[PDB]
Write a protein that binds this ligand. Structure first.
Ligand SMILES: [Cu+2]
Length: 99
């Protein structure tokens, strides 16, 4: 599943921001507009026992180029909340459910 980092109108949003996937399904987060961006899973809002560092950028890491991606596949079932650190208060957040 492809997720844009920044909308095509420049909005600071993940597109889509809420979605569901199955285990091992690739998520490709792709810099689109308004970069740098990152994608950080909130360590307090992911499934039991999951290591956020296996699945996340750090808050200091950035994707700096249009078209640059961060790929991750999730395995454990449940809800995962994530955000772009520099744009979180602007609303650049999302939630993926693994079912
Ligand atoms: Cu951002």
């Amino acid at each position: 599943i492809d997720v844009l980092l920044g909308a095509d109108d420049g909005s600071l949003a993940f597109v889509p921001s809420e979605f569901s996937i199955s285990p091992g399904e690739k998520i490709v987060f792709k810099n689109n507009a308004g970069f740098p961006h990152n994608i950080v899973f909130d360590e307090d809002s992911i499934p039991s026992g999951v290591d956020a560092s296996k699945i996340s950028m750090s808050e200091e890491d950035l994707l700096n180029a249009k078209g640059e991606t961060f790929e991750v596949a999730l395995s454990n079932k449940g809800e995962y909340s994530f955000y772009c650190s520099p744009h979180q208060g602007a609303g650049m957040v999302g939630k993926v459910t693994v079912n």
